[PDB]
Tab-separated table of C-alpha atoms in Angstrom:
chain	number	residue	atom	x	y	z
A	1303	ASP	CA	-140.657	-167.471	-4.159
A	1304	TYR	CA	-139.098	-166.501	-7.583
A	1305	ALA	CA	-141.053	-169.469	-9.726
A	1306	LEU	CA	-144.021	-167.365	-8.416
A	1307	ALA	CA	-142.761	-164.107	-9.805
A	1308	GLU	CA	-141.665	-165.795	-12.882
A	1309	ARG	CA	-145.797	-166.718	-13.684
A	1310	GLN	CA	-147.289	-163.948	-12.084
A	1311	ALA	CA	-145.045	-161.472	-14.445
A	1312	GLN	CA	-145.852	-163.857	-17.594
A	1313	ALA	CA	-149.607	-163.090	-16.865
A	1314	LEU	CA	-148.991	-159.871	-17.124
A	1315	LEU	CA	-146.851	-160.398	-20.260
A	1316	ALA	CA	-150.026	-161.672	-22.508
A	1317	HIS	CA	-151.498	-158.564	-22.355
A	1318	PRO	CA	-150.445	-155.077	-24.182
A	1319	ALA	CA	-151.447	-152.928	-21.593
A	1320	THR	CA	-149.721	-154.498	-18.837
A	1321	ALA	CA	-146.663	-155.902	-20.749
A	1322	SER	CA	-144.037	-153.227	-19.997
A	1323	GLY	CA	-144.182	-154.033	-16.334
A	1324	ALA	CA	-144.062	-157.189	-17.014
A	1325	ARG	CA	-140.344	-157.039	-18.825
A	1326	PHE	CA	-139.097	-154.429	-15.533
A	1327	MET	CA	-140.356	-157.378	-13.403
A	1328	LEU	CA	-138.719	-160.301	-15.337
A	1329	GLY	CA	-135.469	-158.410	-15.800
A	1330	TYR	CA	-135.120	-158.368	-12.427
A	1331	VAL	CA	-136.988	-161.793	-11.172
A	1332	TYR	CA	-134.462	-163.194	-13.368
A	1333	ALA	CA	-131.458	-161.309	-12.469
A	1334	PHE	CA	-131.905	-162.763	-9.041
A	1335	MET	CA	-132.538	-166.736	-10.641
A	1336	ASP	CA	-128.843	-165.593	-12.097
A	1337	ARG	CA	-130.149	-166.170	-15.017
A	1338	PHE	CA	-128.620	-163.550	-17.149
A	1339	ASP	CA	-129.511	-164.391	-20.477
A	1340	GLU	CA	-133.231	-164.148	-20.111
A	1341	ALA	CA	-132.698	-160.540	-17.822
A	1342	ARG	CA	-130.559	-158.669	-20.380
A	1343	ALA	CA	-132.969	-159.492	-23.546
A	1344	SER	CA	-135.383	-158.843	-21.088
A	1345	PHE	CA	-134.429	-155.040	-20.125
A	1346	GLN	CA	-133.341	-154.647	-23.978
A	1347	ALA	CA	-137.047	-154.733	-25.539
A	1348	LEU	CA	-137.796	-152.234	-22.836
A	1349	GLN	CA	-134.761	-150.311	-24.504
A	1350	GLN	CA	-136.056	-150.838	-27.929
A	1351	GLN	CA	-139.265	-149.819	-27.238
A	1352	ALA	CA	-138.301	-146.673	-25.544
A	1353	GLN	CA	-136.438	-145.533	-28.797
A	1354	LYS	CA	-139.442	-146.386	-30.757
A	1355	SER	CA	-141.348	-143.670	-28.923
A	1356	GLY	CA	-138.691	-140.763	-27.679
A	1357	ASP	CA	-139.012	-140.838	-24.520
A	1358	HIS	CA	-135.613	-141.036	-23.291
A	1359	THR	CA	-136.372	-141.088	-19.628
A	1360	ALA	CA	-137.230	-144.959	-20.377
A	1361	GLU	CA	-134.456	-145.637	-22.265
A	1362	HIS	CA	-131.365	-144.217	-19.736
A	1363	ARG	CA	-133.764	-146.773	-17.164
A	1364	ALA	CA	-133.372	-149.783	-19.414
A	1365	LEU	CA	-129.669	-148.767	-20.386
A	1366	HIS	CA	-128.688	-148.901	-16.806
A	1367	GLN	CA	-130.875	-152.355	-16.087
A	1368	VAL	CA	-129.068	-153.899	-19.064
A	1369	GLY	CA	-125.880	-152.598	-17.577
A	1370	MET	CA	-126.300	-153.882	-14.183
A	1371	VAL	CA	-127.153	-157.465	-15.422
A	1372	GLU	CA	-123.840	-156.942	-17.688
A	1373	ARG	CA	-121.782	-156.212	-14.592
A	1374	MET	CA	-123.473	-159.464	-13.108
A	1375	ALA	CA	-122.938	-161.483	-16.009
A	1376	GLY	CA	-119.152	-160.180	-15.251
A	1377	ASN	CA	-119.348	-158.730	-18.684
A	1378	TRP	CA	-117.439	-155.518	-17.495
A	1379	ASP	CA	-116.609	-153.996	-20.981
A	1380	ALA	CA	-120.421	-154.399	-22.444
A	1381	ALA	CA	-121.104	-152.842	-18.441
A	1382	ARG	CA	-119.020	-149.980	-19.117
A	1383	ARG	CA	-120.888	-148.963	-22.239
A	1384	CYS	CA	-124.183	-149.174	-21.326
A	1385	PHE	CA	-123.008	-146.584	-18.583
A	1386	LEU	CA	-121.096	-144.388	-20.765
A	1387	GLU	CA	-124.206	-144.144	-22.704
A	1388	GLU	CA	-126.518	-144.063	-19.943
A	1389	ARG	CA	-124.467	-140.415	-19.104
A	1390	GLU	CA	-125.158	-139.231	-22.099
A	1391	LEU	CA	-129.016	-139.427	-22.272
A	1392	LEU	CA	-129.061	-138.035	-19.035
A	1393	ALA	CA	-126.709	-135.063	-19.910
A	1394	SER	CA	-129.553	-133.642	-22.554
A	1395	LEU	CA	-132.155	-135.074	-19.841
A	1396	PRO	CA	-133.191	-132.671	-16.856
A	1397	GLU	CA	-131.459	-132.879	-13.614
A	1398	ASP	CA	-132.257	-136.151	-11.349
A	1399	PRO	CA	-130.060	-136.449	-8.539
A	1400	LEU	CA	-130.859	-139.845	-7.802
A	1401	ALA	CA	-130.557	-141.164	-11.516
A	1402	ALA	CA	-126.937	-139.765	-11.642
A	1403	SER	CA	-126.030	-140.873	-8.220
A	1404	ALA	CA	-126.676	-144.907	-9.243
A	1405	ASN	CA	-124.944	-143.940	-12.689
A	1406	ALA	CA	-122.136	-142.061	-10.918
A	1407	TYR	CA	-121.936	-145.129	-8.225
A	1408	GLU	CA	-121.807	-148.095	-11.163
A	1409	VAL	CA	-119.475	-145.914	-13.033
A	1410	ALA	CA	-116.875	-145.995	-10.134
A	1411	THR	CA	-117.512	-149.671	-9.826
A	1412	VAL	CA	-116.008	-150.420	-13.224
A	1413	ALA	CA	-113.216	-148.194	-12.908
A	1414	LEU	CA	-111.699	-150.023	-9.850
A	1415	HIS	CA	-112.667	-153.139	-11.524
A	1416	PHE	CA	-110.133	-151.780	-14.294
A	1417	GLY	CA	-107.808	-149.996	-11.717
A	1418	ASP	CA	-108.841	-146.395	-12.711
A	1419	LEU	CA	-108.252	-145.687	-8.924
A	1420	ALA	CA	-108.525	-141.901	-9.133
A	1421	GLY	CA	-111.517	-142.191	-11.903
A	1422	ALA	CA	-113.478	-144.359	-9.331
A	1423	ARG	CA	-112.668	-141.969	-6.259
A	1424	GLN	CA	-114.228	-139.129	-8.090
A	1425	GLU	CA	-117.095	-141.163	-9.058
A	1426	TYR	CA	-118.070	-142.570	-5.795
A	1427	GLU	CA	-117.409	-138.966	-4.737
A	1428	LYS	CA	-120.726	-137.520	-7.510
A	1429	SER	CA	-122.635	-140.570	-6.398
A	1430	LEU	CA	-122.366	-139.508	-2.576
A	1431	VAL	CA	-122.895	-136.245	-3.227
A	1432	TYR	CA	-125.887	-137.112	-5.395
A	1433	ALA	CA	-127.849	-139.205	-3.123
A	1434	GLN	CA	-127.410	-136.725	-0.477
A	1435	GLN	CA	-129.421	-134.400	-2.582
A	1436	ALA	CA	-132.236	-137.149	-3.475
A	1437	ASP	CA	-132.063	-138.396	0.080
A	1438	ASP	CA	-130.809	-141.988	-0.630
A	1439	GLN	CA	-129.422	-143.610	2.592
A	1440	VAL	CA	-128.487	-146.758	1.139
A	1441	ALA	CA	-126.697	-144.927	-1.586
A	1442	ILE	CA	-124.731	-142.984	0.819
A	1443	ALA	CA	-124.000	-145.993	2.669
A	1444	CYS	CA	-123.158	-147.344	-0.255
A	1445	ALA	CA	-120.643	-144.874	-1.318
A	1446	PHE	CA	-119.018	-144.493	1.628
A	1447	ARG	CA	-118.248	-148.234	1.631
A	1448	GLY	CA	-117.110	-147.938	-1.867
A	1449	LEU	CA	-114.282	-145.377	-1.020
A	1450	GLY	CA	-113.001	-147.596	1.642
A	1451	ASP	CA	-112.526	-150.109	-0.409
A	1452	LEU	CA	-111.389	-148.074	-2.538
A	1453	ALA	CA	-108.881	-146.848	-0.075
A	1454	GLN	CA	-107.760	-150.251	0.899
A	1455	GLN	CA	-106.552	-151.111	-2.656
A	1456	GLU	CA	-104.148	-148.279	-2.627
A	1457	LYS	CA	-103.374	-149.164	1.371
A	1458	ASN	CA	-104.415	-146.566	2.715
A	1459	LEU	CA	-106.022	-148.006	5.527
A	1460	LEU	CA	-106.493	-144.985	7.668
A	1461	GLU	CA	-108.674	-143.733	5.182
A	1462	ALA	CA	-110.418	-147.471	4.796
A	1463	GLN	CA	-111.105	-147.440	8.305
A	1464	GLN	CA	-113.026	-144.028	8.426
A	1465	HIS	CA	-115.324	-144.615	5.592
A	1466	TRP	CA	-116.186	-148.217	6.757
A	1467	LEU	CA	-117.030	-147.328	10.133
A	1468	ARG	CA	-119.208	-144.671	8.315
A	1469	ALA	CA	-120.995	-146.929	5.688
A	1470	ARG	CA	-121.232	-149.532	8.511
A	1471	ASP	CA	-123.060	-146.842	11.158
A	1472	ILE	CA	-125.474	-146.245	8.300
A	1473	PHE	CA	-126.436	-149.589	7.444
A	1474	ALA	CA	-126.613	-150.212	11.284
A	1475	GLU	CA	-129.478	-147.452	11.549
A	1476	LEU	CA	-131.122	-148.921	8.254
A	1477	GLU	CA	-131.300	-152.082	10.213
A	1478	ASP	CA	-129.699	-154.104	7.552
A	1479	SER	CA	-127.444	-156.653	9.696
A	1480	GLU	CA	-126.452	-158.504	6.398
A	1481	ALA	CA	-124.342	-155.153	5.251
A	1482	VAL	CA	-122.664	-154.206	8.645
A	1483	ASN	CA	-121.715	-157.913	9.227
A	1484	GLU	CA	-119.612	-157.433	5.846
A	1485	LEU	CA	-118.304	-154.249	6.971
A	1486	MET	CA	-117.120	-155.740	10.186
A	1487	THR	CA	-114.826	-158.371	8.355
A	1488	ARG	CA	-113.545	-155.637	6.552
A	1489	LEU	CA	-112.999	-153.674	9.578
A	1490	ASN	CA	-111.674	-156.849	11.490
A	1491	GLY	CA	-109.290	-157.787	8.890
A	1492	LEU	CA	-107.435	-154.226	9.087
A	1493	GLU	CA	-105.583	-155.825	11.774
A	1494	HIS	CA	-101.823	-158.156	11.990
B	1306	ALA	CA	-129.830	-158.283	-7.519
B	1307	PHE	CA	-127.158	-158.575	-5.004
B	1308	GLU	CA	-126.453	-155.901	-3.054
B	1309	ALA	CA	-128.040	-153.695	-0.672
B	1310	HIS	CA	-127.805	-151.005	-3.478
B	1311	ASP	CA	-129.664	-152.896	-6.085
B	1312	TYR	CA	-132.886	-152.797	-4.141
B	1313	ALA	CA	-132.674	-149.233	-3.068
B	1314	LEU	CA	-132.300	-148.657	-6.410
B	1315	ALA	CA	-135.133	-150.942	-7.493
B	1316	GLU	CA	-137.599	-149.602	-4.992
B	1317	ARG	CA	-136.431	-145.789	-6.320
B	1318	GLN	CA	-137.371	-147.347	-9.603
B	1319	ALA	CA	-140.400	-149.231	-9.178
B	1320	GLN	CA	-142.283	-146.057	-7.349
B	1321	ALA	CA	-141.199	-144.182	-10.871
B	1322	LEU	CA	-142.890	-147.049	-12.867
B	1323	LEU	CA	-146.335	-146.363	-10.305
B	1324	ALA	CA	-146.552	-143.411	-12.349
B	1325	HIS	CA	-147.217	-145.064	-15.995
B	1326	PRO	CA	-150.503	-147.209	-16.248
B	1327	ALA	CA	-148.310	-149.777	-18.622
B	1328	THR	CA	-145.464	-150.320	-15.890
B	1329	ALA	CA	-148.110	-150.048	-12.642
B	1330	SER	CA	-148.581	-153.663	-11.853
B	1331	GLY	CA	-145.432	-155.089	-12.420
B	1332	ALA	CA	-143.895	-151.822	-10.053
B	1333	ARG	CA	-146.553	-153.193	-7.589
B	1334	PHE	CA	-144.721	-156.393	-8.024
B	1335	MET	CA	-141.548	-155.304	-7.776
B	1336	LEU	CA	-142.340	-153.354	-4.698
B	1337	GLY	CA	-143.884	-155.884	-2.748
B	1338	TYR	CA	-140.823	-157.899	-3.005
B	1339	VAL	CA	-138.292	-155.195	-2.438
B	1340	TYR	CA	-140.246	-153.948	0.484
B	1341	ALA	CA	-139.798	-157.707	1.699
B	1342	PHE	CA	-136.247	-158.039	1.633
B	1343	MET	CA	-136.178	-154.807	2.976
B	1344	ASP	CA	-138.460	-155.962	6.223
B	1345	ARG	CA	-140.710	-152.951	5.707
B	1346	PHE	CA	-143.684	-155.225	6.686
B	1347	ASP	CA	-146.721	-153.014	6.280
B	1348	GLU	CA	-145.943	-151.545	3.225
B	1349	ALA	CA	-145.224	-155.317	1.514
B	1350	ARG	CA	-148.559	-156.449	2.582
B	1351	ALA	CA	-150.361	-153.517	1.411
B	1352	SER	CA	-148.680	-154.027	-1.962
B	1353	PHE	CA	-149.635	-157.314	-2.582
B	1354	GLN	CA	-152.890	-156.667	-0.974
B	1355	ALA	CA	-153.358	-154.163	-3.564
B	1356	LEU	CA	-152.728	-157.093	-6.265
B	1357	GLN	CA	-155.023	-159.598	-4.666
B	1358	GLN	CA	-157.861	-157.333	-4.904
B	1359	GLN	CA	-157.472	-155.701	-8.025
B	1360	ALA	CA	-157.003	-159.955	-9.300
B	1361	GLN	CA	-160.438	-160.536	-7.648
B	1362	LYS	CA	-162.668	-157.632	-9.141
B	1363	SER	CA	-161.193	-159.325	-12.928
B	1364	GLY	CA	-162.419	-162.430	-11.945
B	1365	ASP	CA	-158.687	-163.720	-12.158
B	1366	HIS	CA	-158.771	-166.463	-9.287
B	1367	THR	CA	-155.346	-167.660	-10.917
B	1368	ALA	CA	-153.738	-164.191	-10.237
B	1369	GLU	CA	-155.598	-163.871	-6.724
B	1370	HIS	CA	-154.533	-167.449	-4.991
B	1371	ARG	CA	-150.707	-166.432	-6.540
B	1372	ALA	CA	-151.391	-162.696	-4.830
B	1373	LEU	CA	-153.061	-163.764	-1.503
B	1374	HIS	CA	-149.907	-166.491	-1.570
B	1375	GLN	CA	-147.513	-163.379	-0.881
B	1376	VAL	CA	-149.571	-161.654	1.526
B	1377	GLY	CA	-149.716	-164.836	3.897
B	1378	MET	CA	-145.454	-164.954	3.152
B	1379	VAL	CA	-145.197	-161.382	4.011
B	1380	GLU	CA	-147.167	-161.875	7.445
B	1381	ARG	CA	-145.156	-165.162	8.355
B	1382	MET	CA	-141.745	-163.061	7.920
B	1383	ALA	CA	-143.725	-160.178	9.823
B	1384	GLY	CA	-144.337	-163.132	12.537
B	1385	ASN	CA	-148.674	-162.426	12.197
B	1386	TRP	CA	-148.803	-166.265	11.981
B	1387	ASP	CA	-152.363	-165.843	12.538
B	1388	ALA	CA	-153.371	-163.651	9.527
B	1389	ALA	CA	-150.548	-166.190	7.914
B	1390	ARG	CA	-152.594	-169.361	8.649
B	1391	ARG	CA	-155.876	-167.680	7.179
B	1392	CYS	CA	-154.102	-166.707	3.871
B	1393	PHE	CA	-152.588	-169.781	3.561
B	1394	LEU	CA	-155.915	-171.803	4.112
B	1395	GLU	CA	-157.921	-168.968	2.296
B	1396	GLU	CA	-155.682	-169.724	-0.855
B	1397	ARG	CA	-155.514	-173.420	-0.453
B	1398	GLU	CA	-159.605	-173.350	-0.594
B	1399	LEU	CA	-159.352	-171.100	-4.012
B	1400	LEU	CA	-156.599	-173.607	-5.214
B	1401	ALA	CA	-159.010	-176.541	-5.017
B	1402	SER	CA	-161.249	-175.238	-7.248
B	1403	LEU	CA	-159.174	-174.502	-10.185
B	1404	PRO	CA	-157.367	-176.600	-12.439
B	1405	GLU	CA	-154.069	-178.436	-10.877
B	1406	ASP	CA	-150.849	-176.546	-10.778
B	1407	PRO	CA	-148.854	-179.019	-8.900
B	1408	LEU	CA	-145.829	-176.055	-8.151
B	1409	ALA	CA	-148.550	-174.018	-6.401
B	1410	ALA	CA	-150.027	-176.900	-4.514
B	1411	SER	CA	-146.461	-177.473	-3.384
B	1412	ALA	CA	-145.693	-174.434	-2.191
B	1413	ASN	CA	-148.680	-173.959	-0.466
B	1414	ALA	CA	-148.674	-176.491	1.768
B	1415	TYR	CA	-145.052	-176.146	2.650
B	1416	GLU	CA	-146.593	-172.845	3.912
B	1417	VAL	CA	-149.350	-174.606	5.990
B	1418	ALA	CA	-146.757	-177.052	7.513
B	1419	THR	CA	-144.792	-173.944	8.131
B	1420	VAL	CA	-147.569	-172.445	10.152
B	1421	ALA	CA	-148.564	-175.764	11.768
B	1422	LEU	CA	-145.072	-176.459	12.690
B	1423	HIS	CA	-144.794	-172.675	14.286
B	1424	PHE	CA	-148.345	-174.030	16.289
B	1425	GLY	CA	-147.339	-176.963	17.292
B	1426	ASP	CA	-149.569	-179.142	15.433
B	1427	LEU	CA	-146.623	-181.958	14.537
B	1428	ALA	CA	-149.023	-183.985	12.747
B	1429	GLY	CA	-150.177	-181.859	10.433
B	1430	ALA	CA	-146.853	-180.341	9.353
B	1431	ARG	CA	-145.868	-183.480	8.436
B	1432	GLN	CA	-148.585	-184.308	6.641
B	1433	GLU	CA	-148.549	-181.286	4.728
B	1434	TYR	CA	-145.039	-180.837	4.653
B	1435	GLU	CA	-145.072	-184.701	2.569
B	1436	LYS	CA	-147.615	-183.493	0.623
B	1437	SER	CA	-145.705	-180.356	0.081
B	1438	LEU	CA	-142.989	-182.682	-1.622
B	1439	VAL	CA	-145.327	-185.084	-3.500
B	1440	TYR	CA	-146.736	-182.012	-5.640
B	1441	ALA	CA	-142.529	-180.999	-5.263
B	1442	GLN	CA	-142.168	-184.189	-7.499
B	1443	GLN	CA	-145.302	-183.567	-9.464
B	1444	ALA	CA	-143.774	-180.417	-10.634
B	1445	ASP	CA	-140.484	-181.326	-11.244
B	1446	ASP	CA	-138.933	-178.507	-9.060
B	1447	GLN	CA	-135.843	-178.611	-7.277
B	1448	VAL	CA	-136.177	-176.178	-5.253
B	1449	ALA	CA	-139.721	-176.904	-3.938
B	1450	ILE	CA	-138.092	-180.664	-3.523
B	1451	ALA	CA	-135.275	-179.382	-1.489
B	1452	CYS	CA	-137.652	-176.663	0.647
B	1453	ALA	CA	-139.777	-179.650	1.447
B	1454	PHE	CA	-136.923	-181.953	2.522
B	1455	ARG	CA	-135.731	-178.626	4.820
B	1456	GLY	CA	-139.114	-178.146	6.483
B	1457	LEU	CA	-139.359	-181.987	7.373
B	1458	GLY	CA	-135.703	-181.628	8.838
B	1459	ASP	CA	-136.782	-178.976	10.828
B	1460	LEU	CA	-139.952	-180.785	11.852
B	1461	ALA	CA	-137.967	-184.136	13.361
B	1462	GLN	CA	-135.447	-181.695	15.369
B	1463	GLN	CA	-138.946	-180.625	16.724
B	1464	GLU	CA	-139.580	-184.117	17.601
B	1465	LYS	CA	-136.400	-184.815	18.808
B	1466	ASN	CA	-134.965	-187.177	16.063
B	1467	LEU	CA	-131.648	-185.806	15.274
B	1468	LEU	CA	-130.430	-188.544	12.895
B	1469	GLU	CA	-134.007	-188.138	10.965
B	1470	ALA	CA	-133.340	-183.881	11.231
B	1471	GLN	CA	-129.756	-184.530	9.818
B	1472	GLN	CA	-130.638	-186.970	6.699
B	1473	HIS	CA	-133.329	-184.624	5.354
B	1474	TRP	CA	-131.086	-181.618	5.788
B	1475	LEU	CA	-128.351	-183.026	3.921
B	1476	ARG	CA	-131.016	-184.073	1.399
B	1477	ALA	CA	-131.765	-180.518	0.986
B	1478	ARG	CA	-128.172	-179.382	1.526
B	1479	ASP	CA	-127.230	-181.453	-1.404
B	1480	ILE	CA	-129.904	-180.408	-3.907
B	1481	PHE	CA	-129.326	-177.090	-2.915
B	1482	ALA	CA	-125.575	-177.653	-3.990
B	1483	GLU	CA	-125.846	-179.286	-7.401
B	1484	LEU	CA	-128.069	-175.289	-7.871
B	1485	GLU	CA	-125.314	-173.214	-6.582
B	1486	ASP	CA	-127.944	-171.549	-4.236
B	1487	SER	CA	-124.937	-171.064	-2.039
B	1488	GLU	CA	-127.065	-169.090	0.353
B	1489	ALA	CA	-129.380	-172.350	0.871
B	1490	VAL	CA	-126.647	-174.289	1.583
B	1491	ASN	CA	-126.000	-172.026	4.306
B	1492	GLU	CA	-128.875	-171.922	6.181
B	1493	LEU	CA	-129.219	-175.760	6.319
B	1494	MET	CA	-125.162	-175.573	7.109
B	1495	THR	CA	-126.353	-173.350	10.725
B	1496	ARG	CA	-128.886	-175.845	11.422
B	1497	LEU	CA	-126.746	-178.663	11.441
B	1498	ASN	CA	-124.457	-177.111	13.758
B	1499	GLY	CA	-127.381	-176.903	16.165
B	1500	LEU	CA	-128.200	-179.893	17.597
B	1501	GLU	CA	-126.293	-180.120	21.021
B	1502	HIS	CA	-128.031	-183.511	22.238
């Protein structure tokens, strides 16, 4: 599957006119194949291109992607830096609730990873409300799962339960049976 | 890559990148994969079908066979096995007139084998799975080797060879274990716990 996509995208890289779609593709492709060093380099070339061109739209997008791989690489400090910087560019750009939800959600994950629980509460909450605006049901679902996991960490199981049943419900309508199942582990582990 | 959030985001990113000639091809590709993952299969097929036509109106037979292959993979996942058969067989003739590409030969044969297995051509299945395995080894591709062995296992289960299927799946399990494909090893583990006689 993946080693097939890698050649397709490597053919797209040969031609200046398609090279940038190749890099976006390779970033993700390499991220699936768990090769985070090539995914980062792939996403960074796109960032550097956005810088020497102006458009802070390609740049914010490349930054979020770089921070995504940093997170997957377990470099949480580099991730923090990328999402904080992406947040700056966005404050200067025209409003984009989808961009802001994805950024909010990622800042909430980093914050939770580092123990700023009140901060993660606020970011998942932003991420949720921005997702309603943008109509992205999967982001809404993910936000509730995130709030619930935050609640469990605080031993607020009454809250964890309510948020996890909501995320579970949305994922079922989306027919994402993997996410439903994972929220079931969470919920049933809520016993004695 | 990873959770539901990554894919939903990736899709919306790819919808944005369709808006730019420089990023449009890359984005159609990603949309094909993402739609597939999401069991949104009509949308996955059309995405790949569009790349295939792009490919064929450029003279690019290489890009054409590889696009066509994903159309078939999408049809299999959808359960449109005849459309799938027709894709993979079609792709095979294209391949037969292109320079040696072991890795694409392995993948094609594996798909043709899988088709024939669904349809019950157990002589066909064996032939193609073995060819998929020969080309896998010619390419030095662990994943293709492991998948070919898994298919050989599924074929032995259909043949009702409980120890043959057992040896092949373990071979597949092992290879998938020394690649840390933590989910493939799990797909194999489910198969093993499923031989009640």
